Every structure is written in structure tokens, then in C-alpha cells.
């Protein structure tokens with residue numbers, strides 16, 4: 246049966262990997278949160294595998310197991326980083342829920358009724374570790390997620406580690422795919438159980454896992470219809486409105502049709518998250534703290550000649566632009582919706 | 595009661611006018627078709643009345659009773675026109691229904707499932723009169739509507755009549771309102787009972803009644819929501835989808851909120867139909883043939899500085915442009931609807 | 944000038960190939 | 962170049978005032 250064969254292919258991140266030296270199962274199923282939708286495995290490949298090159302070229306996710314991208318950073322923990330990462334400020338988000346929904350603070354002026362479920366506090370790295378240690382022994386419920394672009398202020402040893410990254414491999418990827426510049430490296434340090442809810446980014450991403458394990462659930466650009474992003478002028482622009490823990494099928498009926506691609510990344514793994522791909526990222530339950538460094542690249546420019554039919558990501562680009570232009574032309578972002586509704590009701594729906 | 599006072603103001607075209615020399619009621623109520631919505635009178639004013647100038651300036655409909663705009667054309671009938679209008683071709687529409695819905699023949703390639711309820715035949719003027727006489731004595735059901743832009747081929751007497759139009763008055767209106775050029779004069783010769791269903795035009799219109807009586811029902815640009823025009827790429831672009839004789843309230847719920855401005859124009863009356871105003875025009879039942887000449891002017895250009903909030907007609911302009919741009923960008927007009935729906939569903943509605 | 948681009952109008956009326 | 966105007970993209974990512 247195609248139905249039974251479908252349930253076989255819906256195998257998620259699959260059989261948990263065995264760590265070298267018989268050091269036991271890396272992780273187990275009970276560490277994964279439970280969701281309402283099926284998932285297919287993201288290919289886990291060698292960088293020298295021609296299939297991997299083909300997937301990156303076609304802008305499809307692949308986990309590369311042996312890039313050595315952040316090889317020198319594999320020795321990073323809280324102690325090493327507190328000693329070496331400098332006296333700069335670090336953005337630390339704090340929430341009472343496990344979900345850390347990103348919000349654009351520049352867009353909060355348009356949406357005054359929006360109240361953020363997380364707070365951003367700028368602190369020193371030793372303060373983050375102190376606040377982390379504080380919650381751990383107090384048995385508190387507060388969750389933290391350090392999310393900071395790595396800058397000038399990092400110390401000499403972090404700079405040295407940075408130099409030891411596999412720039413050869415990634416410079417060639419940037420070159421071959423026609424991408425623009427590297428815009429940032431985001432350091433992510435999360436607590437066990439922390440969730441970054443489904444969203445897409447407008448940049449190409451090499452997601453380099455350093456410490457702990459992250460389950461990454463991805464959705465293709467053509468599933469825009471199933472994922473219901475906030476309006477473009479909303480602070481949560483690019484993020485799904487659907488609560489994955491309790492999906493509102495009345496408001497979001499096509500979420501019943503959503504199908505993910507998932508994997509669990511650990512130390513040394515690099516996940517290619519293609520531009521415009523939805524991703525939901527969770528630090529495994531009871532897995533300890535996680536560390537990731539991403540590499541964000543501006544996408545390749547719009548091709549000289551347009552080909553038809555359009556790709557899913559091009560239609561997303563289009564919809565975004567329609568929303569922006571309408572916001573500007575109407576002089577008020579709040580007016581976009583009423584105009585769009587007026588445009589389709591009894592005309593296109 | 596405001597409800598009773600509302601039913602008083604909803605007086606339609608009002609008390610039928612008395613023709614000079616006690617020649618009886620110009621028309622009576624039984625000649626008007628019955629519709630589901632209320633209507634308010636369009637002001638019927640002298641051209642020298644300051645209110646009339648104010649209404650045209652504010653782009654609101656007004657009937658001017660004494661312009662003398664087409665004074666020399668008041669002697670026009672079928673015999674006089676057949677004798678003088680030339681050997682040129684005339685577009686004659688033919689229908690089995692009373693409704694003459696305009697269709698863009700250039701847009702019919704996008705919409706192959708669209709079948710026109712009327713047919714265009716090019717003929718000579720004597721052929722139109724012959725075909726008209728043919729149906730009249732045969733007791734047929736076929737309806738004709740001559741609709742032809744007046745051109746080079748008109749004879750000397752029609753040219754002479756044209757010269758005697760009140761160009762002074764209308765040139766000053768064109769000048770004062772900042773309008774563009776006169777683009778055409780449409781001759782309309784319809785049979786009693788003929789209906790032009792609700793639509794708007796993208797030009798300013800002075801609608802000069804010559805023979806017989808027409809009931810004109812107008813709706814302001816802000817009633818776009820109640821009138822449900824076809825998609826912009828549809829042959830019936832700018833026309834209401836609502837069948838006024840049998841309105842589909844399931845498909846078109848806000849048609850229950852529609853409120854018109856109506857008048858009956860006769861020989862010598864000029865109705866200003868402002869650009870973007872919906873108009874439904876019907877030749878009175880058992881009123882004989884009707885003759886009208888319109889004057890179509892390109893609207894005044896987009897002002898240098900934009901003012902907020904936007905006017906209703908500007909939002910209409912905007913919606914039209916969004917539909918056009920999407921048609922072009924997607925490479926296929928049929929794709930506009932699916933993209934628009936995807937954009938709003940569970941996001942803006 | 945996106946606002947100006949969106950506010951521009953044509954001259955379409957009910958007359959064939961005009 | 963309306964098609965090109967509609968196909969253009971920004972560089973927005975989850976990082977504050979970037």
C-alpha cells in the first residue's frame with residue numbers, strides 16, 4: 246500500500262546515531278517533542294559526495310557530516326567562551342515559555358497591541374553564565390537564549406579559532422552558488438528544551454552545530470499556504486502564526502497538509518538551510534545546553550532572464566513586495582488587509 | 595424616525611417632470627425597472643447655478659438642464675441620421691436579453707470559457723434602421739444597441755451640427771477641472787427597455803441626452819465593496835458581476851448595502867458621470883428609441899503631492915494596478931487569483 | 944515613486960479596440 | 962521592469978537592528 250509505504254518514508258530524523266568508541270546512543274526519541282504532522286529525513290552526506298553538491302545547487306537541505314567548518318570551535322563550552330569571548334555585550338532573550346518567537350522591535354510601532362512573550366537584555370558573557378547557573382540550582386522555570394552576532398570585541402583565542410574555520414570549503418560554496426557576502430555569524434546558546442518556532446530567513450544559511458543536539462524541522466517554500474506567516478509589517482514577519490503545540494485548524498486549515506523534512510544535528514554537523522525554507526529548531530529535551538554558529542549569506546541576485554513557471558520562492562518574494570508596496574502607498578500598514586480583502590472577496594475567492 | 599426620514603430621502607428620480615405646453619407627464623413610474631436597493635435623487639440644476647459648479651469640481655454627479663451642449667442635435671432622429679451620418683461602419687450589438695454587458699474582445703484570449711451574451715456586427719446606418727424596422731413589424735424579441743464613436747465619415751450636416759455644440763461651456767469645464775483631451779464622442783442608439791449594466795469608466799463623462807428618456811443609476815467609488823467587478827483581466831473588467839434582476843446574495847453579500855443616486859434624463863439634459871462612478875443606464879420601458887452622445891475626457895493627472903487618507907477612486911486605481919502587475923509578473927492572468935488568496939487566507943481575513 | 948506607480952490610471956471605456 | 966521590481970528581495974534574518 247502507498248499509505249503503508251508513506252508511513253515508512255515518514256521516518257523523521259530516523260534511527261539515532263551511535264557515537265564513536267561505543268559511547269552509547271547520541272540521543273533518544275523521548276527527547277523529541279511531539280507534533281501533528283509527518284516528516285521525511287534530510288539527507289546526511291559527506292561533503293565530497295556529489296549528491297550533496299547537487300542538493301546545495303538545487304537549494305535543498307542537506308546535512309554535511311565532515312566539512313570541518315567550525316572544527317576549532319568544537320572545544321567551545323561556557324567556561325572556554327567566558328574566558329575568551331571578550332567584554333562585549335550579548336543579546337540574551339528570556340521567556341517563561343519554551344518558545345522563543347523572534348520579534349522585530351522596529352515594527353512594534355505599527356502593532357501596539359502586540360505584547361512580546363520574550364524579553365531582550367544586553368549583558369556581559371559572565372553575566373549570562375551567572376544567570377544560567379542561578380536558574381539551574383534554584384530550580385527555576387525561566388529560560389534563556391543567547392543570540393549574538395559575533396563582532397570586533399571577541400578575544401584573541403576566539404579570533405584564532407575563527408581563523409581555523411574551513412574558509413576554503415565555504416568560500417568555494419559561496420563562489421559556486423553565486424551568493425552575495427557573508428553578512429554575519431550568529432552565536433546561539435540555548436537551554437535544553439528551547440524552541441525557535443517555524444520561520445524563514447531571507448539569506449542562505451550554513452548552520453554549524455558545535456555543542457549538544459538540535460532537531461531541525463524544515464518545510465519547502467511551496468508550503469507557504471500551510472504555514473500562515475504574520476503580515477509583513479507585523480513584528481513577527483516571516484514567522485508562522487500556527488502554534489505547533491496546539492494548532493488552530495479553524496484559522497489555519499492547510500496546516501493539516503504540512504509535511505516536514507527533519508534531522509538531528511550534533512557537534513561537527515553542518516545543515517544547509519536554503520533561503521526561504523521554513524525551519525523550526527529545538528534543543529533536545531534533557532540534552533543540556535546547545536551551541537551553534539550560523540553563516541548567513543545574501544542570496545544570489547535576480548537572474549537576467551526570468552523563466553516560467555515561477556519558483557515557489559519567487560512567488561513568496563512577490564507576495565512580500567505586494568504587502569510592502571501597499572503599506573507604503575496606503576500610508577498606513579493597518580490598511581493593507583482591508584484593501585486586500587476588498588480586492589478578492591466575491592472577485593477571486 | 596430616522597428610518598422614516600430615510601425612506602423619504604430614498605425618493606429615486608422623484609416626481610416625473612411636466613413637459614412644456616401641458617404635453618403631459620414626460621414618463622411614468624411603470625416605465626422604470628424594479629430593483630432591490632434604495633436610491634437618492636441626483637441634483638438637477640441650472641449650469642449657471644454655483645452648486646452645479648461645486649458638484650462637478652468635487653466630482654459628484656449633477657444633471658445640468660440648460661447647457662445647450664448638443665442643442666443642434668436635438669432634431670436628430672433615425673430618418674435625419676440615415677440621411678446625413680455618412681457611409682461609415684457602425685458597431686451594432688445584438689442580444690436576446692435586455693442587458694447589454696460590454697466585453698473586451700482583446701481580453702477574450704485569457705478567458706476561453708467566457709461566452710458573450712451579445713454580438714457585435716459592423717453595418718451601414720441604413721442597415722441598422724432596416725434591421726430595426728424589420729424587428730418592429732415582425733414582432734420579434736431581438737434587441738439592438740448601436741454604439742459607435744463618431745468619426746471622419748459623418749456627412750456635412752452632422753459636421754455642421756457638431757460645430758453648433760456648446761464648445762464654449764465644455765472647453766471651460768475641461769479647462770477648469772484640469773482634465774486631459776476629449777478622446778471620443780460615443781453615439782448611443784438603443785431600443786426601449788435596453789439596459790447597460792452597472793460599470794465604471796476610466797474617463798470623465800458628460801452624458802448628453804438627445805432623444806427619449808434614460809434612467810441613470812449611479813454609485814460612488816466607495817461602493818466598490820458592494821458591486822464586485824470582474825477581475826481586471828476578464829473581458830468584463832470594470833463591470834459588476836451582480837445580476838441586478840436576480841442578485842446572488844450568497845456570492846455578493848454586500849450588495850445588500852448598496853445605495854444609488856438616480857435620475858431620468860431627457861432631451862437637452864446633460865448628466866455629469868464622474869470618472870470611476872458606477873452607472874447603470876436603462877432606456878425606459880415602452881418609451882421608444884433613445885439617442886445619447888457622450889463626451890469622454892481623460893482624467894486630470896496624478897497630483898504632485900499625495901494627500902492622506904486616500905480617496906476611494908485612488909484605492910480603486912491601486913487595486914487595478916496590483917491586478918495588472920501580478921498578471922504581468924506571474925506571466926499568466928489565471929494565476930493572479932490563487933496568489934491573492936494565498937496572500938490573505940489566515941493572514942489578513 | 945512606488946506610490947505614484949500604483950496611483951497611475953488608464954483611459955479604458957466601453958468602446959471596442961479604442 | 963515591474964516583474965524585476967516584484968522579484969527583488971531583502972536580506973532580513975532573526976537578528977535585531979541588523
Ligand SMILES: O=C(O)CNC(=O)C(=O)O
Nearest residue numbers: 433441446450526537539
Ligand atoms: O538555532 C536556532 O534556534 C534558530 N536559528 C535560526 O533560525 C537560523 O540559524 O536561521
Ligand SMILES: O=C(O)CNC(=O)C(=O)O
Nearest residue numbers: 782790795799875886888
Ligand atoms: O448609455 C448607455 O447605455 C451606456 N453609456 C455609458 O456607459 C457611458 O456613456 O459611459
Ligand SMILES: [Zn+2]
Nearest residue numbers: 445446524975
Ligand atoms: Zn532562522
Ligand SMILES: [Zn+2]
Nearest residue numbers: 794795873957
Ligand atoms: Zn459607461
